[PDB]
């Protein structure tokens, strides 16, 4: 057997080879199919389809027939003791019940939250952190890796944490000069006036691309607002996430945004399908997504910047077919 040391802190001894893995987290999910450990995996979290998106399933179509014996919040034991699992992944703000309901029944758990920062805050949802671009990029690099070791994909999982972080000296080099004064206003609208503020990848996306996340001086995490809130900090673009694409036409219909200095200049963006700007930081999120928004809001700075390239290249490798455009 191995000990590791899960993103709660935890201590956990898990087989030496893990073949049916329950994933109860959509973005170890993503990562362990960018690692090609889908083979290993017997059961996902039930709202994957939501989480991931409907496009998600041409990229690993192998989820479509996959049993869901919980989801990111709850679980259902009779249902998972039927998979026979030998460890179950699950998200760092899990609650406590639903761990201990896995831990009861003897099957090891393992806790990914992609950041480290500090300890007093990782099982939380909604994190207060001094360093978040360290806790993310750190968060990040060990999460991957932990689920890299789970699964025995460590080559793998090296070449992924370096994709994921090759194109951000580029980008620092790029937008180097841009001013806070200047840095552009972005707002990230998604269902039921949902947005992110402080302590989220959302916001340091948008930093790394010469942006700025409205939301994040006055909201905590993932929070529904009001639109008396998006009047008043009257965002220069609005980005959307590609796996809620009804949001961009319905802000388009609703008159009462039609004020937003965004809806005047016509800079209501869906965002591309690797272009996750999450809560959590996502290997592809880093290394295209924050291309692909840098290169919208300063064209003229990455004209030599063939993302089409970049993208087809990191889909071959990682999700073993080529990016196809919605």
Do not use: C
Request: no cysteine.
């Amino acid at each position: 057997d191995r000990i590791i040391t899960d993103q709660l802190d935890r201590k956990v001894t898990i087989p030496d080879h893990i073949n049916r893995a329950v994933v109860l987290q959509h973005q170890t999910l993503n990562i362990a199919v960018q690692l090609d450990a889908t083979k290993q995996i017997v059961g996902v979290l039930s709202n994957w389809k939501k989480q991931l998106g409907k496009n998600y399933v041409r990229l690993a179509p192998e989820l479509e027939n996959m049993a869901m014996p919980g989801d990111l919040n709850s679980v259902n034991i009779e249902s998972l003791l039927a998979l026979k699992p030998d460890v179950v992944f699950v998200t760092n703000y899990a609650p406590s019940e639903m761990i201990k309901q896995i831990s009861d029944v003897n099957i090891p758990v393992v806790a990914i939250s992609l950041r480290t920062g500090e300890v007093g805050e990782k099982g939380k949802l909604n994190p207060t952190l001094t360093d978040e671009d360290k806790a993310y990029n750190d968060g990040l690099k060990q999460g991957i890796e932990l689920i890299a070791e789970v699964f025995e994909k460590k080559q793998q999982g090296d070449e992924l944490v370096k994709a994921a972080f090759a194109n951000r000296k580029l980008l620092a080099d790029r937008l180097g000069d841009v001013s806070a004064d200047k840095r552009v206003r972005t707002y990230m609208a998604n269902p039921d006036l949902g947005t992110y503020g402080s302590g989220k990848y959302t916001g340091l996306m948008m930093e790394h691309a010469g942006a700025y996340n409205v939301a994040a001086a006055t909201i905590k995490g993932f929070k529904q607002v009001s639109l008396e809130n998006v009047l008043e900090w009257n965002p220069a673009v609005i980005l959307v996430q590609d796996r809620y694409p009804d949001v961009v036409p319905q802000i388009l219909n609703d008159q009462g945004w039609a004020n937003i200095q965004a809806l005047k200049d016509k800079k209501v963006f869906l965002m591309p399908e690797y272009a996750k700007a999450w809560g959590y930081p996502m290997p592809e999120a880093l290394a295209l997504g924050e291309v692909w928004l840098a290169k919208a809001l300063y064209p003229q700075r990455f004209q030599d910047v063939d993302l089409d390239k970049m993208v087809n290249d990191y889909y071959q490798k990682f999700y073993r077919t080529s990016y196809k455009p919605d």
